[PDB]
Amino acid sequence: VDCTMYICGDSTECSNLLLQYGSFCTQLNRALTGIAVEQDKNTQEVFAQVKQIYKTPPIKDFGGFNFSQILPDPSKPSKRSFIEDLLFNKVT
Amino acid sequence: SALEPLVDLPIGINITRFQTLLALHRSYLTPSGWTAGAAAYYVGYLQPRTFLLKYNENGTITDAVDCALDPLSETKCTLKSFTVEKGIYQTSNFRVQPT
Ligand SMILES: *[C@@H]1O[C@H](CO)[C@@H](O[C@@H]2O[C@H](CO)[C@@H](O)[C@H](O)[C@H]2NC(C)=O)[C@H](O)[C@H]1NC(C)=O
Ligand SMILES: *[C@@H]1O[C@H](CO)[C@@H](O[C@@H]2O[C@H](CO)[C@@H](O)[C@H](O)[C@H]2NC(C)=O)[C@H](O)[C@H]1NC(C)=O
């Protein structure tokens, strides 16, 4: 969020005064950036713990355990389990 | 080049224009004399700009950096450092302006 533009819409009359509050404009960006930087660290450590990208063999005999729901859908342009797409519907 | 203030004087006048001064002389009969030697100099106009000033242990400023010089120079003014670590930094925003 750009403090200067948010507080003072595109107008120097207000922009001048904002200079008198000092870092309040900037340090917010530092706070927000502080959030948004680590927001990818979250997704970093949660999802990528894996050194290499595995992929299942072409043929599945697991002993009768049918994973074709959870495995990536080869046909969807974005390869995603049949289940995952249910989620992407339910959330907006 | 670091320039110390010589004298801070009460002038109180606006100066909008000027010219330099010269030292010439007279010569005597040869095939009056003027324009001793050659003369050339450099002139440039000032302008408000934000510089980051790096003093030395003895206060001798070496590195100065303008913030508005290029989109690269404006980020170094955000980190205040002359060393810029490998990565992405967010320089001041830009706006499209009305025609
Ligand atoms: C795993 O399950 C999927 C669906 O849950 C099976 O795919 C179905 O196979 C039948 C044939 O028996 C077809 O009539 C259906 O149209 C298929 N559905 C889908 C969505 O493709 C699959 O055969 C099962 N495989 C194993 C090894 O259990
Ligand atoms: C600086 O000196 C200039 C004179 O050169 C003054 O500026 C003039 O201001 C009038 C308006 O009052 C304009 O019509 C002129 O065109 C200006 N001069 C030029 C050369 O453009 C000015 O008054 C002086 N500074 C201050 C602070 O008064």
XYZ file of C-alpha atoms and ligand atoms in Angstrom:
247
model
C 0.000 0.000 0.000
C 1.475 3.325 -1.033
C 1.010 5.688 1.876
C 1.727 8.812 -0.151
C -0.929 8.051 -2.747
C -3.401 6.429 -0.358
C -3.448 9.224 2.203
C -2.947 12.081 -0.240
C -4.615 11.453 -3.530
C -2.173 12.559 -6.233
C -1.903 16.045 -4.717
C 1.209 17.779 -3.444
C -0.747 20.003 -1.042
C -1.299 16.913 1.069
C 2.025 15.372 0.043
C 3.960 18.203 1.681
C 2.271 17.747 5.052
C 2.919 14.006 4.958
C 6.634 14.809 4.985
C 6.168 16.209 8.478
C 5.081 12.856 9.905
C 8.394 11.405 8.776
C 8.710 7.651 8.541
C 5.020 6.899 9.122
C 4.674 6.782 5.359
C 7.721 4.599 4.765
C 7.800 2.317 7.785
C 4.367 1.006 6.861
C 5.799 -0.216 3.572
C 8.601 -1.751 5.601
C 5.959 -3.450 7.730
C 3.876 -4.625 4.778
C 6.944 -5.689 2.830
C 8.020 -7.420 6.020
C 4.792 -9.389 5.792
C 4.771 -10.007 2.060
C 8.406 -11.121 2.036
C 7.809 -13.910 4.516
C 4.435 -14.792 3.000
C 6.468 -16.603 0.379
C 8.712 -18.062 3.061
C 5.605 -19.737 4.459
C 4.729 -21.337 1.135
C 8.446 -21.985 0.707
C 8.904 -24.227 3.720
C 5.454 -25.802 3.694
C 5.295 -26.982 0.103
C 8.923 -27.195 -0.993
C 10.734 -29.459 1.392
C 11.505 -31.764 -1.499
C 14.826 -31.720 -3.306
C 13.595 -33.084 -6.634
C 10.286 -33.192 -8.463
C 9.205 -36.808 -8.584
C 6.563 -38.139 -10.895
C 4.683 -41.401 -10.672
C 5.540 -44.167 -13.115
C 3.330 -44.367 -16.201
C 1.533 -47.469 -14.902
C -0.124 -47.871 -11.504
C -0.312 -51.145 -9.663
C -0.447 -50.206 -6.000
C -2.268 -53.345 -4.944
C -5.746 -52.016 -5.597
C -5.298 -48.569 -4.075
C -6.785 -46.160 -6.578
C -5.026 -42.808 -6.418
C -6.361 -41.491 -9.719
C -8.348 -39.025 -7.644
C -5.351 -37.529 -5.842
C -2.749 -37.769 -8.577
C -2.330 -34.881 -11.021
C -4.968 -34.862 -13.700
C -2.947 -35.269 -16.909
C -5.761 -33.809 -19.040
C -6.492 -30.567 -17.154
C -4.207 -27.757 -18.598
C -3.099 -27.167 -15.020
C -2.282 -30.636 -13.782
C -4.186 -30.893 -10.514
C -5.837 -33.779 -8.741
C -9.538 -34.190 -9.342
C -9.860 -33.340 -5.660
C -7.914 -30.080 -5.797
C -10.277 -28.690 -8.419
C -13.190 -29.247 -6.052
C -11.390 -26.920 -3.662
C -10.698 -24.231 -6.247
C -14.437 -24.190 -6.869
C -15.468 -23.947 -3.232
C -13.084 -21.131 -2.385
C -13.397 -17.869 -4.289
C 35.780 16.878 -5.419
C 34.684 18.089 -1.997
C 34.234 21.851 -1.667
C 34.237 23.523 1.700
C 32.297 26.763 2.207
C 34.742 29.649 2.166
C 32.652 32.502 3.575
C 28.932 32.646 4.308
C 28.059 36.274 3.545
C 24.977 38.507 4.006
C 24.207 39.238 0.325
C 20.418 39.632 0.344
C 20.302 40.200 -3.432
C 18.906 37.929 -6.120
C 21.497 37.343 -8.852
C 19.907 36.227 -12.119
C 22.833 36.789 -14.505
C 26.599 37.195 -14.613
C 29.841 36.956 -16.597
C 33.422 36.105 -15.616
C 36.396 38.470 -15.418
C 39.732 38.497 -17.182
C 43.312 39.683 -16.847
C 44.941 40.969 -20.043
C 47.874 43.279 -20.724
C 49.630 45.496 -23.245
C 52.326 44.660 -25.771
C 54.657 46.855 -27.819
C 55.693 47.105 -31.367
C 55.592 43.714 -33.092
C 54.012 42.708 -36.408
C 47.902 46.862 -28.971
C 48.744 43.471 -27.371
C 45.785 41.659 -25.700
C 44.444 38.148 -24.790
C 47.466 36.885 -22.739
C 47.764 33.093 -23.219
C 44.690 30.942 -23.680
C 41.572 30.834 -21.513
C 38.844 28.228 -21.106
C 36.606 27.146 -18.250
C 33.637 24.990 -17.290
C 30.145 26.058 -16.242
C 27.085 24.111 -15.173
C 23.862 24.997 -13.389
C 22.744 23.680 -10.024
C 19.472 21.906 -9.253
C 17.698 20.424 -6.208
C 18.603 16.756 -5.815
C 18.826 14.275 -2.953
C 22.370 13.001 -2.424
C 23.520 10.289 -0.072
C 26.784 11.492 1.444
C 29.449 9.038 2.589
C 31.837 10.669 5.029
C 35.195 9.098 5.778
C 36.742 8.314 9.194
C 38.186 11.882 8.849
C 34.895 13.312 7.446
C 36.270 13.550 3.863
C 33.284 12.743 1.619
C 34.212 10.441 -1.241
C 31.161 8.634 -2.628
C 28.033 10.659 -3.266
C 25.023 9.259 -5.116
C 22.084 11.086 -6.648
C 18.715 9.474 -6.023
C 16.872 10.661 -9.150
C 19.802 9.925 -11.548
C 18.384 6.604 -12.830
C 15.867 3.961 -11.552
C 18.936 2.161 -10.208
C 20.248 5.167 -8.268
C 16.950 5.750 -6.452
C 17.017 2.324 -4.738
C 20.533 2.891 -3.302
C 18.988 5.904 -1.561
C 16.403 3.570 -0.061
C 19.041 1.217 1.416
C 21.288 4.240 2.291
C 24.184 1.902 1.387
C 26.708 2.011 -1.427
C 26.713 -1.785 -1.317
C 23.512 -3.241 -2.745
C 22.991 -6.879 -1.874
C 21.850 -9.330 -4.509
C 18.080 -9.268 -4.648
C 15.020 -7.237 -5.552
C 14.293 -3.900 -3.904
C 11.229 -1.709 -4.189
C 12.042 1.787 -5.432
C 9.505 4.610 -5.276
C 6.269 4.070 -7.154
C 5.464 5.547 -10.536
C 2.218 6.980 -11.848
C 0.857 7.550 -15.276
C 0.043 11.198 -15.623
C -2.953 12.882 -17.371
C -2.724 14.187 -20.907
C -9.843 -45.587 -10.319
O -11.016 -44.820 -10.207
C -11.390 -44.160 -11.421
C -12.571 -43.286 -11.083
O -12.719 -43.173 -9.676
C -11.703 -45.205 -12.477
O -12.013 -44.557 -13.704
C -13.316 -45.005 -14.124
O -13.244 -46.280 -14.773
C -14.528 -46.779 -15.176
C -14.309 -48.179 -15.697
O -14.430 -49.142 -14.658
C -15.132 -45.838 -16.213
O -16.418 -46.312 -16.591
C -15.243 -44.434 -15.631
O -15.689 -43.527 -16.633
C -13.895 -43.966 -15.089
N -14.032 -42.677 -14.431
C -13.173 -41.669 -14.604
C -13.474 -40.413 -13.842
O -12.197 -41.763 -15.342
C -10.501 -46.117 -12.668
O -10.836 -47.182 -13.551
C -10.054 -46.697 -11.337
N -8.834 -47.469 -11.509
C -8.367 -48.311 -10.584
C -7.097 -49.025 -10.932
O -8.943 -48.490 -9.518
C 14.984 38.156 -8.749
O 15.300 39.064 -9.679
C 14.314 39.035 -10.716
C 14.729 40.073 -11.730
O 15.582 39.540 -12.731
C 12.880 39.257 -10.192
O 12.066 38.446 -11.030
C 11.128 39.160 -11.840
O 9.802 39.037 -11.318
C 8.794 39.702 -12.093
C 7.490 39.525 -11.353
O 7.423 40.365 -10.210
C 8.758 39.125 -13.502
O 7.802 39.838 -14.280
C 10.134 39.233 -14.143
O 10.128 38.593 -15.415
C 11.186 38.577 -13.249
N 12.510 38.722 -13.831
C 13.000 37.880 -14.746
C 14.383 38.178 -15.244
O 12.356 36.919 -15.154
C 12.602 38.838 -8.745
O 11.726 39.785 -8.141
C 13.869 38.691 -7.893
N 13.627 37.816 -6.749
C 12.759 38.066 -5.761
C 12.692 37.025 -4.685
O 12.054 39.078 -5.745
